[PDB]
Design an enzyme around this catalytic site. Structure first.
Site, mmCIF file in Angstrom:
data_model
loop_
_atom_site.group_PDB
_atom_site.id
_atom_site.type_symbol
_atom_site.label_atom_id
_atom_site.label_comp_id
_atom_site.label_asym_id
_atom_site.label_seq_id
_atom_site.Cartn_x
_atom_site.Cartn_y
_atom_site.Cartn_z
ATOM 1 N N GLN A 85 0.877 -1.214 0.000
ATOM 2 C CA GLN A 85 0.000 0.000 0.000
ATOM 3 C C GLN A 85 0.899 1.244 0.000
ATOM 4 O O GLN A 85 2.012 1.170 0.558
ATOM 5 C CB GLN A 85 -0.962 -0.034 1.196
ATOM 6 C CG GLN A 85 -2.346 0.537 0.902
ATOM 7 C CD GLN A 85 -2.518 1.961 1.377
ATOM 8 O OE1 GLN A 85 -2.684 2.223 2.567
ATOM 9 N NE2 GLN A 85 -2.504 2.897 0.442
ATOM 10 N N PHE A 86 0.448 2.332 -0.631
ATOM 11 C CA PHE A 86 1.177 3.626 -0.700
ATOM 12 C C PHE A 86 1.162 4.285 0.683
ATOM 13 O O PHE A 86 0.060 4.490 1.241
ATOM 14 C CB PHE A 86 0.565 4.562 -1.747
ATOM 15 C CG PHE A 86 1.123 5.964 -1.726
ATOM 16 C CD1 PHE A 86 2.468 6.192 -1.971
ATOM 17 C CD2 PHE A 86 0.311 7.053 -1.449
ATOM 18 C CE1 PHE A 86 2.989 7.477 -1.946
ATOM 19 C CE2 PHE A 86 0.833 8.339 -1.429
ATOM 20 C CZ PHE A 86 2.171 8.548 -1.678
ATOM 21 N N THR A 126 -3.925 5.323 -4.567
ATOM 22 C CA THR A 126 -3.011 4.182 -4.266
ATOM 23 C C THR A 126 -2.733 3.423 -5.565
ATOM 24 O O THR A 126 -3.684 2.872 -6.148
ATOM 25 C CB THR A 126 -3.583 3.250 -3.187
ATOM 26 O OG1 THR A 126 -3.716 3.996 -1.973
ATOM 27 C CG2 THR A 126 -2.722 2.029 -2.932
ATOM 28 N N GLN A 127 -1.470 3.417 -5.991
ATOM 29 C CA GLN A 127 -0.987 2.733 -7.214
ATOM 30 C C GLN A 127 -0.062 1.583 -6.811
ATOM 31 O O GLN A 127 0.264 1.476 -5.614
ATOM 32 C CB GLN A 127 -0.212 3.716 -8.090
ATOM 33 C CG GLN A 127 -1.077 4.781 -8.735
ATOM 34 C CD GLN A 127 -0.345 5.513 -9.833
ATOM 35 O OE1 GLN A 127 0.603 5.002 -10.432
ATOM 36 N NE2 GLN A 127 -0.792 6.725 -10.115
ATOM 37 N N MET A 157 -3.556 11.059 -2.200
ATOM 38 C CA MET A 157 -3.338 9.593 -2.045
ATOM 39 C C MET A 157 -3.407 8.900 -3.412
ATOM 40 O O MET A 157 -3.903 7.761 -3.477
ATOM 41 C CB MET A 157 -4.382 8.982 -1.101
ATOM 42 C CG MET A 157 -4.242 9.446 0.333
ATOM 43 S SD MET A 157 -2.631 9.011 1.038
ATOM 44 C CE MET A 157 -2.783 7.227 1.135
#
Ligand code: MG
Ligand code: MG
Ligand code: MG
Lengths: 235, 195, 244, 204, 240, 222, 231, 212, 233, 4, 4
Positions: free
Chosen positions: F1-2, I1-2, I107
């Site tokens: 997850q980022f 989110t990537q 994000m």
């Protein structure tokens, strides 16, 4: 009919010019700025003797260091005062300081032209905003429904304004005491008021650095009215 | 919040509500009234999530008081309970539901009959001769099944309630610091000061 | 812009009247007469159909008298289409109240809400008001039998006997003459028909030009029945009173 | 925290010769705790009967919702809604909440006033229609009810016989389920008379 | 949404829609407020061109906003309902957040604020209504009487009248009401109110409504016979 | 997850004198075990004799300083070129930080300057805008190493007057700018020795009534 | 006549009367002068008072460290447009770390004023602006009119009797353009220019308002005793 | 954190510690956990430092607007309910606030309201809030009477914080004392636990657990 | 989110006396698969700036489009678009830095590490870094990915501090960069032999070199390596 | 983040 | 759900 935000051939906004006529019909309000403080005084002008005059609130506190007197459609002033109070308190919350009298006035004047086809018409009320700050000291501002404001050493607005302003031109000097200014407001109000001036149909207030903005009691104003009459008879 | 009981007898409804307000390992208060008067002849006790309980009670109180002024008329206990249920039934499918359980004790002046309504936070309404919320029910229901009679007086109802509080003080793990008792009858709502 | 073509439907005259409300009332004054008469043991609703044609289907028709719930009915005077918009709103408001409180809506509450909708169209929105006057005949357990009227202004008032639409001036004088408080339903039925019979712009009052309805406690023990009269039932009641 | 089995309860409907029967238990509980022994799950809008099992707040909400809808239907149509039509209304209304459903197992029962034909139908929580000649079952003891109905049931039972069959089907199914029972109600529905009987059953 | 500025300034500095709203008030049935030493009385005219009325169910001219405050009005009846409803909601909202019923001044200031908003909002006409708002502040025995008008201005009055022929009954009150000594009792205050309406009304039958408000949420409306006794007493003293 | 946050290390230190204030910071910028820059300043002159540093996540630190600098500019425009007092700046920064209460600025903020009486002032902030005026504050990675030393040497904590039987405390007194810079230099050399994220260079910004002066000193580069 | 009701209506000769009436508000406004060399740009503004008891309406507004304008007409409209310029100057700084070019400033004001002249309900801006600035291509002076027309000039003047100052600057063009590295002499030329637009009244200490921007000079305004030097 | 406020014959006593922590790190010993909203209103802080400091400063702005609009000092009930209604709107968002609104008005008399971030609002005579509340309760409850003198009440409040300051790892620094009368709040000084502990131990003869 | 799909590896750069050098290999990796071998990761903006991009290639191609669009927009109503009001390296960087931080704050980041190398109009060397978090820093030497770990140590032996920049020639600086690219080819498993190199000099301008190859590689010693300890054959 |  |  015609647009609300229309220019006249002379280059003025019709609705702004017509609101200025409404303000001329309003009860008189006078402000005088000295080095000892700023005095605000108004004509109450009760429509009937049954009306309890002390319920006529034409002088109003914005913060401890800023007072306000009004003339014209006084109902319109309620949302202007509400905005000014919120602006003053909000600025204190964000910056932990008193807000400059000029910055408060400028905030009120930003509402003025927020009308068209925002609210449906300009405000039908002019405000005398008196206050003190550390930077520019004791200040008196005239806030119009045009969105313009001028600083004044002294200023009269309402029905008796042009007559009162000519009187303030002669009387005002840069060395006036607070007590002299109080008597001067009472003197000029008594001249331009229809009914005879007393403590029930006229109200005094002042803002000083030390005690902040104070509306005078009917007892205190009554003594200044009695002091004024004696001094005029004394020469 | 925790213990709220209700007993409908011949001529009145009796609501008992625990006085303890606990947070963590500290009893913050031991004199808390977990009830609001909705109208002169309708009382609502409440228990559940902190904050939600009072916020929901006062919101219902405001709406019933508004109806009373508008129509110059007191809503029947049946009508108030149906209104309260529908508010909770909306709540449960909200973003953040009210986690509040209520008893509504009322005297219907038109029918001349006491009425007790039990409503949970899902909006599950039932009319009962006696009701409870939370763990209290697990003791009081079986006790009332035995000792309760439908034709009892208010004094008999209070003795039956004392029997419930004594059983709860004996077998309940937590100290709930006794109960505030209120009677709803034809003459309105009054509080028993010595219990 | 579009300012040029705005009628300004929600403004005051110099005299302090609402133009569009006054003109809507003028519209209603040409509509078929509707009468409500409230007795001690029920309410009568009578209404005259607007100049009928001989090929109009009379039995499967509803112009004047509409059912709001099991306890409340209305008589219409004005634009039928406008009335049906308001009736569907009133029918929903009644079911909303029942869903919320598990009790049939008190008559005045339903009337006030429908009257509050009409008021809105006179104060904001820049739309024309509804060209409709209602006679509400209903029963609830608080006030019992109740007659009301509402008009495009959104003002409502209670009545013992009232008329709306055409020749109300004449109709109200005849009702004010022959009405009394201890009156029975069967007497009120006779008064309603006798009033229309005299105030009608037609040559003679016949069954095919009338809509008729009663709200009695004439069911079995402490319950209210609504009776929207059939053509044959109006024909019988018209012979029984001796108008034909 | 399974919505369909918090409160508990059962409904069963059967067809006979020129008659239908619908029956339900009276229990409302909070899991183990029995709360009410008066909670009826069968309602009626004119001559159309609806039983609803599942989460009790939705049983109450849907009853109030269908009363609302059938009342407006009758005012506009100027006639009582028929079972076949009401079935379609229930299905529409449930599928409107497809991705946030009412946790219910509704059962329609009634005799078409025009054709005189007995009609029963069941639905899942998402509104799928289950039409049947013989019987419909719903609730926490649906398995038990399926077993009882499939063995006991025979076609073209007289009202008085059908009463015995549906009653024994419900009672014996309820006694094998912890969350069902605490009393039962049976509606016997003929063309123009309806008898409602409260059954004596074990109270555990 | 409908946006048109209906309330606008004219060359002479008047807002005609606000002034035409006052004409609707002047058309409305007379309403009078007189505050005594320990009470306020609201008197209301009811025009007698309407017989066959049902006085049980007909909307009463004086409305309770809370248990301690009342509101009478002159002008458009339909408009009055919208102000009353808003005031009643604000009354319950104030109790909910401040844990104290509204003052009469606060409730007046709110109703006045609503009336003002409709004088400089697009798509709306002003309220064709002036109000008399009377009552007692919580835990206070000093009588309160306030007036509002379509413009949004409000003020406190010892005694005041609004509606048709209000200038005649204001003339009466101006000479008959002593500031130094207000009506000492309930009877005195009600009598002065009925007297003031009898200058204008016609007959003292079912044409006068009287509502008496006393401290601690003590509000009661007088019946026909109760009011008729004051009418009978005043007329007998007059013949002198 | 980022993960939207990172740690760029470094440490900052503010000390207040009688008629002056210093705000010091190391010039090292890191991610994990890599050095990004040996000279990347994070102590900024914001105008009106206010110096500011937002140590922690450099992206959030630069964003905040940028927004406050912009806040000062608009304060001049909206209030007739009025000087923003250090107390007023502090309250403004609280509102900036608390604005992102539910997605915080991952930085520790210190401002220094003179109060309206001309006396040295230091304000310190948590990530979500709780603030407090102090004589003394260290912030960032080596705060836990430096702060207790400052307690001992600036505020004279746990130090008693010799021969008074630990009854009379060492009296509080203002330090000279010369004495304060000695403590800053010794604080950072000590921090550099024992913390891997501290070193390369030390940049001090000194604030007197005469304006903002700078001083630079080499630190160990290991 | 029939075609001046709103800004959305053309006249039969192809005129926008509401725009022309807005243009009229400027002519009623107090005189203000703009002029530049290669090194510095100067604004000189005659401020106007309501009476002797009143203050003198401030004519000059700062937009950035390198840019600002003087106004003539509706002051609230000047506040709106100056506030918009402050934001655009500020956007250029934060996003591109780039001082906004005085030419782009003009283009942005032009496009903002235009939208108000083509849409129903809105009205034209009732103010004219003289924007001075020093950017990467030296000193600049712009003249904004609320029609949307923006013009880059060596010198100009707007307001009442502006034709006097505009004629003088047209004569003096060759002299004042080469006042390089001398602020005081460029101001003197600006003060002498505005003096050609005076009738009965003369330049006093609380009457005169001067602003300057240049190579090593941030945009700074001079009022009160600071301008006494130039009378 | 340890904050207490209790009601007695002589008014209200408000006592707080001055410690701010970041886990086991002692961030500060000089934190002001009492906000003076107005001359008759005090607010205590426990939980999230930013959450308490921001919203209690904001509460002060709302109380000022009330007295400008209503020409009358806000009631303790109304002031407490503005803050409780605010945090209730944020319920589930993760505000952490334990708060006592202490003050005097004519209509109410001396009043204390507990307000926390899950929306609980309680009127009461005694409250202790924070990580060290149980330690403060122990000393306060066992010595509390209604008839305490102003001198004794001030000391008991001070001694109850000292008690918690000692035992609770997350409480200490110094004790800040306040006394609320009909005439408003009076500040009774900052008392460093460094000197106060030894002074109390010696004079009182208590704290026999500690090596003297 | 990537999550990044097709990726580019190290971008390395340093300052010298008169300008800046930047280099990056021509590979687009698809995890462990060396999918695309013709990818240009150095994108010139005008004649005074080069933007080197590592990370996701789809997001790189998006940034290419933004820069291409920035040049067009700058030319609009701009007579000095090829003179005083031409795009500066500092302007191009601050724009990208703003975008990167806005995207992380929503994000939804651009999954990249970016080095903007160029020469300002006043002749000053510009070299600054920005990544998916919006973190920015400047240094005489900058590198992304494996470059940060292996290139920087080698480049810092040439220019260790500011005072070393005037003493470093373009010959010495380029040699250091080409050596670093060889080391990265030895040791980075997602690198290629083929790379691009750009020099921005304040005198000679922008020199863009394509189809360079790592050469002078030491592999001969491998023949002497037998087993992992005990094996002799 | 501080706590109190 | 009923499945098919
Ligand atoms: Mg339940
Ligand atoms: Mg069992
Ligand atoms: Mg190190």
């Amino acid at each position: 009919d015609r647009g609300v935000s229309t220019f006249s051939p002379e280059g003025r906004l019709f609705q702004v010019e017509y609101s200025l006529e409404a303000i001329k019909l309003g009860s008189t309000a006078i402000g005088i700025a000295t080095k000892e403080g700023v005095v605000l005084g108004v004509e109450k002008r009760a429509t009937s003797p049954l009306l309890e005059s002390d319920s006529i609130e034409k002088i109003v506190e914005i913060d401890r260091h800023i007072g306000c007197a009004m003339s014209g459609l006084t109902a319109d002033a309620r949302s202007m005062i509400e905005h000014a109070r919120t602006a003053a308190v909000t600025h204190n919350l964000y910056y932990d300081e008193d807000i400059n009298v000029e910055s408060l006035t400028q905030s009120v004047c930003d509402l003025a032209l927020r009308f068209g086809e925002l609210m449906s018409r300009p405000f039908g009320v002019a405000l005398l905003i008196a206050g003190h700050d550390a930077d520019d000291g004791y200040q008196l501002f005239h806030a119009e429904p045009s969105g313009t404001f001028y600083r004044y050493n002294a200023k009269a607005i309402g029905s008796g304004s042009e007559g009162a302003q000519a009187e303030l031109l002669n009387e005002w000097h840069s060395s006036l005491t607070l007590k002299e200014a109080e008597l001067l407001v009472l003197k000029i109000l008594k001249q331009v008021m229809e009914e005879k001036l007393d403590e029930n149909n006229a109200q005094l207030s002042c803002i000083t650095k030390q005690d902040g903005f104070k509306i005078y009691d009917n007892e205190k104003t009554a003594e200044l009215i009695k002091e004024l009459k004696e001094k005029e008879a004394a020469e | 919040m925790d213990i709220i009981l209700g007993i409908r007898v011949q001529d009145s409804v009796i609501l008992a509500s625990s006085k303890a307000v606990t947070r963590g390992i500290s009893v913050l208060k031991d004199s808390d009234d977990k009830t609001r008067q909705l109208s002169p002849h309708t009382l609502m006790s409440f228990a559940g999530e902190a904050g939600d309980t009072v916020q929901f009670a006062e919101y219902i109180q405001a709406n019933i008081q508004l109806y009373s002024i508008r129509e110059d008329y007191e809503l029947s206990p049946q009508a108030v309970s149906s209104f309260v249920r529908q508010e909770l039934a909306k709540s449960i499918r909200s973003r953040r539901p009210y986690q509040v359980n209520v008893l509504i004790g009322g005297y219907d002046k038109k029918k001349n009959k006491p009425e007790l309504y039990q409503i949970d936070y899902l909006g599950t309404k039932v009319e009962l001769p006696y009701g409870a919320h939370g763990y209290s029910g697990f003791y009081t229901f079986s006790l009332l099944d035995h000792h309760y009679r439908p034709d009892m007086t208010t004094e008999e109802g209070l003795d039956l309630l004392k029997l419930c509080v004594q059983e709860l003080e004996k077998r309940m793990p937590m100290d709930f610091k006794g109960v505030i008792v209120k009677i709803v009858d034809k003459d309105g709502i009054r509080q028993v000061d010595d219990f | 812009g579009s300012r040029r073509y705005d009628s300004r439907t929600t403004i005051f005259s110099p005299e302090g009247r609402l133009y569009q409300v006054e003109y809507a009332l003028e519209s209603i004054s040409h509509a078929g007469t509707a009468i409500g008469i409230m007795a001690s043991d029920g309410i009568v609703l009578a209404a005259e159909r607007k100049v009928t044609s001989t090929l109009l289907e009379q039995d499967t028709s509803t112009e004047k008298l509409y059912k709001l719930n099991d306890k409340i009915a209305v008589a219409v005077a004005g634009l039928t289409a406008d009335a049906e918009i308001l009736i569907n709103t009133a029918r929903i408001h009644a079911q909303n109240y029942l869903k919320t409180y598990n009790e049939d809506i008190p008559v005045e509450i339903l009337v006030r809400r429908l009257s509050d909708i009409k008021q809105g169209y006179t104060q904001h929105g820049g739309l024309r008001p509804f060209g409709v006057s209602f006679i509400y005949a209903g029963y609830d357990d608080r006030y019992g039998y109740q007659l009301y009227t509402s008009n495009p202004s959104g003002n409502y008032t209670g009545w013992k006997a009232i008329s709306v639409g055409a020749n109300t001036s004449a109709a109200q004088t005849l009702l004010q003459m022959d009405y009394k408080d201890d009156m029975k339903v069967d007497d009120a039925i006779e008064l309603a028909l006798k009033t229309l019979s005299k105030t009608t712009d037609s040559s003679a009052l016949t069954y095919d030009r009338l809509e008729f309805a009663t709200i009695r406690k004439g069911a079995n023990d402490g319950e209210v029945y609504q009776k929207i009269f059939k053509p044959q039932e109006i024909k019988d009641i018209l012979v029984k009173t001796g108008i034909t | 925290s399974d919505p369909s089995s918090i409160n508990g309860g059962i409904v069963v409907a059967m067809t006979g010769k020129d008659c239908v029967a619908i029956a339900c238990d009276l229990r409302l509980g909070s899991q183990s705790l029995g709360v009410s022994n008066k909670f009826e799950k069968i309602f009626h809008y004119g001559h159309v009967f609806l039983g609803i099992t599942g989460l009790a707040t939705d049983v109450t909400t849907l009853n109030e919702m269908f009363r609302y809808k059938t009342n407006l239907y009758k005012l506009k149509e100027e006639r009582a809604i028929e079972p076949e039509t009401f079935t379609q209304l229930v299905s529409s209304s449930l599928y409107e909440r497809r991705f946030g459903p009412y946790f219910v197992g509704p059962v329609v029962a009634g005799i078409n006033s025009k054709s005189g034909k007995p009609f029963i139908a069941g639905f899942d929580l998402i509104g799928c229609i289950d039409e049947a000649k013989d019987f419909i079952v719903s609730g926490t003891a649906s398995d038990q009810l399926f077993g009882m109905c499939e063995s006991l049931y025979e076609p073209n039972l007289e009202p008085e016989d059908l009463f015995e069959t549906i009653s024994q089907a419900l009672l014996n199914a309820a006694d094998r389920d912890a969350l069902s029972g605490w009393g039962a109600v049976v509606y016997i529905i003929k063309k123009d008379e309806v008898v409602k009987r409260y059954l004596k059953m074990r109270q555990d | 949404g409908y946006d048109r500025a209906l309330s606008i300034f004219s060359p002479d500095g008047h807002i005609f829609q606000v002034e035409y709203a006052l004409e609707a008030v002047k058309r409305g049935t007379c309403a009078v407020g007189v505050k005594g030493k320990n009470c306020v009385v609201l008197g209301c005219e009811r025009r007698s061109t309407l017989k066959l009325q049902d006085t049980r169910i007909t909307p009463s001219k004086v409305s309770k906003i809370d248990s301690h405050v009342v509101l009478s009005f002159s002008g458009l009846n339909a408009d009055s309902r919208i102000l009353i409803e808003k005031a009643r909601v604000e009354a319950q909202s104030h109790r909910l957040t401040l844990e104290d019923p509204v003052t009469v001044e606060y409730l007046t200031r709110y109703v006045a604020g609503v009336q003002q908003r409709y004088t400089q909002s697009g798509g709306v006409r002003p309220f064709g209504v002036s109000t008399l708002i009377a009552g007692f502040d919580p835990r206070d025995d000093e009588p309160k009487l306030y007036q509002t008008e379509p413009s949004g201005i409000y003020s406190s009055w010892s005694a005041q009248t609004i509606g048709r022929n209000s200038k005649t009954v204001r003339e009466f009150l101006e000479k008959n009401y002593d500031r130094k000594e207000p009506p000492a009792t309930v009877e005195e205050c009600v009598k002065l109110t009925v007297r003031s309406l009898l200058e204008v009304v016609q007959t003292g039958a079912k044409n006068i409504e009287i509502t008496v408000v006393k401290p601690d949420s003590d509000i009661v409306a007088l019946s026909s016979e109760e009011i008729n006794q004051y009418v009978t007493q005043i007329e007998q003293e007059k013949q002198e | 997850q980022f993960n939207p946050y990172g740690d760029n290390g470094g440490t900052i230190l503010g000390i207040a004198g009688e008629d002056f204030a210093v705000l010091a910071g190391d010039t090292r910028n890191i991610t994990d075990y890599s050095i990004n820059s040996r000279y990347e300043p994070k102590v900024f002159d914001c105008g009106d004799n206010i110096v500011m540093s937002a140590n922690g996540f450099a992206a959030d630190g630069d964003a905040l300083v940028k927004r406050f600098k912009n806040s000062v500019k608009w304060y001049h425009f909206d209030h007739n070129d009025k000087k923003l007092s250090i107390n007023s700046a502090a309250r403004n920064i609280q509102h900036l930080l608390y604005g992102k209460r539910f997605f915080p600025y991952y930085v520790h903020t210190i401002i220094a300057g003179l109060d309206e009486d001309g006396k040295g002032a230091v304000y310190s902030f948590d990530p979500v805008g709780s603030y407090e005026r102090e004589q003394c504050r260290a912030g960032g990675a080596a705060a836990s190493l430096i702060m207790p030393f400052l307690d001992n040497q600036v505020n004279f904590k746990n130090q008693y007057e010799p021969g008074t039987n630990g009854k009379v405390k060492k009296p509080l007194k203002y330090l000279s700018v010369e004495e304060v810079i000695k403590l800053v230099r010794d604080s950072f050399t000590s921090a550099t020795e024992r913390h891997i994220q501290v070193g390369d260079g030390l940049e001090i910004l000194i604030v007197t009534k005469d304006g903002v002066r700078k001083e630079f000193y080499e630190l160990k580069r290991d | 006549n029939n075609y001046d009701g709103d800004t959305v209506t053309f006249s039969p000769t192809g005129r926008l009367f509401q725009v022309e009436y807005a243009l009229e508000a400027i002519k009623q406004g107090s005189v203000t002068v703009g002029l530049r060399s290669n090194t510095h740009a100067v604004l000189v503004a005659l401020k106007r008072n309501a009476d002797e008891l009143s203050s003198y309406q401030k004519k000059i507004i700062k937009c950035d460290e390198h840019m600002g304008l003087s106004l003539a007409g509706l002051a609230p409209d000047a506040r709106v447009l100056s506030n918009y310029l402050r934001q655009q100057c500020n956007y250029s700084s934060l996003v591109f770390n780039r001082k906004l070019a005085v030419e782009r400033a003009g283009h942005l004001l032009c496009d903002k004023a235009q939208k108000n002249t083509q849409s129903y309900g809105g009205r034209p801006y009732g103010v004219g602006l003289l924007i001075i600035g020093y950017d990467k291509s030296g000193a600049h002076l712009l003249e904004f009119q609320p029609s949307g027309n923006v013009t880059e000039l060596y010198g100009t003047a707007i307001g009442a009797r502006s034709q006097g100052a505009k004629t003088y600057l047209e004569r003096t063009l060759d002299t004042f353009i080469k006042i390089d590295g001398n602020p005081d002499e460029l101001i003197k030329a600006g003060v002498e220019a505005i003096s050609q637009s005076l009738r009965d009244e003369s330049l006093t200490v609380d009457n005169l308002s001067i602003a300057i921007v240049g190579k090593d000079t941030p945009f700074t305004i001079y009022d009160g005793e600071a301008v006494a030097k130039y009378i | 954190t340890t904050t207490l406020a209790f009601r007695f014959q002589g008014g209200i006593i408000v006592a707080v510690d001055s410690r701010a922590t970041a886990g086991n790190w002692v961030a500060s010993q000089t934190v002001k956990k009492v906000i003076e909203i107005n001359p008759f209103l005090l607010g205590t802080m426990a939980g999230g430092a930013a959450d308490c400091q921001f919203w209690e400063t904001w509460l002060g702005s709302q109380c000022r607007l009330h007295e400008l609009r209503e020409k009358e000092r806000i009631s303790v009930a109304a002031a407490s309910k503005i803050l409780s209604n605010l945090v209730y709107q944020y319920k589930g968002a993760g505000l952490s606030m334990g708060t006592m609104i202490c003050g005097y008005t004519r209509k109410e008399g001396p009043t204390i309201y507990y307000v926390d971030s899950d929306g609980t609002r309680l009127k009461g005579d005694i409250f202790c809030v924070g990580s060290g509340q149980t330690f403060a309760y122990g000393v306060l409850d066992s010595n509390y009477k209604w008839d305490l003198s102003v001198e004794d009440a001030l000391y008991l409040g001070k001694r109850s914080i000292l008690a918690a300051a000692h035992r609770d790892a997350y409480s200490g620094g110094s004790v800040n004392l306040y006394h609320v009368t009909e005439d408003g709040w009076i500040y009774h000084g900052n008392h460093d636990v460094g000197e106060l502990f030894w002074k109390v131990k010696e004079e009182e003869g208590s704290f026999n657990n500690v090596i003297g | 989110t990537q999550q990044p799909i097709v990726t580019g590896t190290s971008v390395i750069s340093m300052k010298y006396d008169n300008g800046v050098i930047i280099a990056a290999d021509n590979l687009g990796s698809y995890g462990s698969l060396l999918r695309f071998n013709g990818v240009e990761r150095l994108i010139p903006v005008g004649d005074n700036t080069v933007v080197g991009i590592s990370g996701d290639i789809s997001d790189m191609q998006h940034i290419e489009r933004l820069l291409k669009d920035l040049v067009t927009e700058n030319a609009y109503d701009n007579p000095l678009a090829d003179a005083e009001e031409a795009l500066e390296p500092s302007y191009i960087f601050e724009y990208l830095a703003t975008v990167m931080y806005q995207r992380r704050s929503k994000m939804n980041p651009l999954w990249n590490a970016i080095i903007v190398a160029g020469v300002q109009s006043n002749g000053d060397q510009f070299l600054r870094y920005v990544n998916l978090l919006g973190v920015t820093y400047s240094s005489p030497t900058l590198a992304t990915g494996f470059g940060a770990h292996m290139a920087n140590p080698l480049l810092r032996k040439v220019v260790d501090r500011e005072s070393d920049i005037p003493k470093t020639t373009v010959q010495v600086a380029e040699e250091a960069i080409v050596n670093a690219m060889r080391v990265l080819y030895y040791r980075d498993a997602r690198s290629s032999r083929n790379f691009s190199l750009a020099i921005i000099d304040k005198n000679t301008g922008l020199t863009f070199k394509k189809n360079l190859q790592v050469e002078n590689m030491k592999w001969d010693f491998a023949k002497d390596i037998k087993g992992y300890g005990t094996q002799k054959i | 983040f501080l706590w109190x």
